[PDB]
Amino acid sequence: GGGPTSSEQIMKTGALLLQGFIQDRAGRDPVPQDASTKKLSESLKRIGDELDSNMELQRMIAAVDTDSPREVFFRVAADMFSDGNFNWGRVVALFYFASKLVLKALSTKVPELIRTIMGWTLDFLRERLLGWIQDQGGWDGLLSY
Template sequence: MACEETPDDQIGEALLIGVIEDQVKSVNAAGDTSSLGIPKPKPLSHAQNQMLLNQLADTIRVIGDRLDMDTGFNDMIDGLGRVANKNSFWKLVEGVFSDGQINWGRIIVLFYSVGKLAAKMVLAHLPEVFSEILNLSLDYFRRTLLQWIRNMGGWINSISGVTRFSIEQFSASSFRRISPSAGQWVVFGAGVLLGGIIVWRLKRFT
């Protein structure tokens, strides 16, 4: 009997929405995001898909912790935050995919960066811009990234690509295009260990 196809659209939307919600909660003392109109992701029907989503969310947190220590990344987010309109999202996309190439690591960086940028709009009390960034990012995922993800075999095949991804290599070619004052770059060195944990846990459900 053939395995049911992983719902890559649901996983991607839930992952992106989760990142945005986490970042907004981190800057909102009350932790209440109900007034922002953040959509609720569709529930995943299989435990393995939920496990994959949870592990991808953990991966973003690990990469995000390293990005947060990077001067260039923070300068980039601060600069985009000052744009304070939907153009900030497109500038972010242009920077992340500056050479037109998509890979797993860049998708993860984009998701985390969107979350940080959205949180900036909440801090600036710009709910309309927040909504624009939220909707644009979901639309960009559906129209551009989802087909690439499916062509690569789905999110289940993202783990090896993410573990090989170097923030140092990416930063030098991308963050600097957005923020000329970029500082020292961070290497994502915990990927191999994290990827091994993810693969081991997923095998328990196969």
């Protein structure tokens, strides 16, 4: 029981294909795939690779205010299929956008991480190191050392 047309396989294979695809676009761990899934993956990388060369698209993905990457995703996903049509090309392009969204999200999430870690370091500095730093006449002490 449970072949390709079942919702279970669709979600399972879908998850493996998307995860594999995203990790694949992030090159510029891996994922476990049986033979046919691997075949599907090649039939996705080709399209991903072509889309990577669409310079205009890249600029517009870069320009998106991603204060809310989730809103962005669903607005794009909704607008894409709003005419009521489907084909594999659209599904793949949607998968392409998701992988790009990951890369974009880091580009917004990562400054945040630095500020946070900086927060800890400077908190510690103010409370634990500053007295000693003042005794050196501040950071000008380090030029000498």
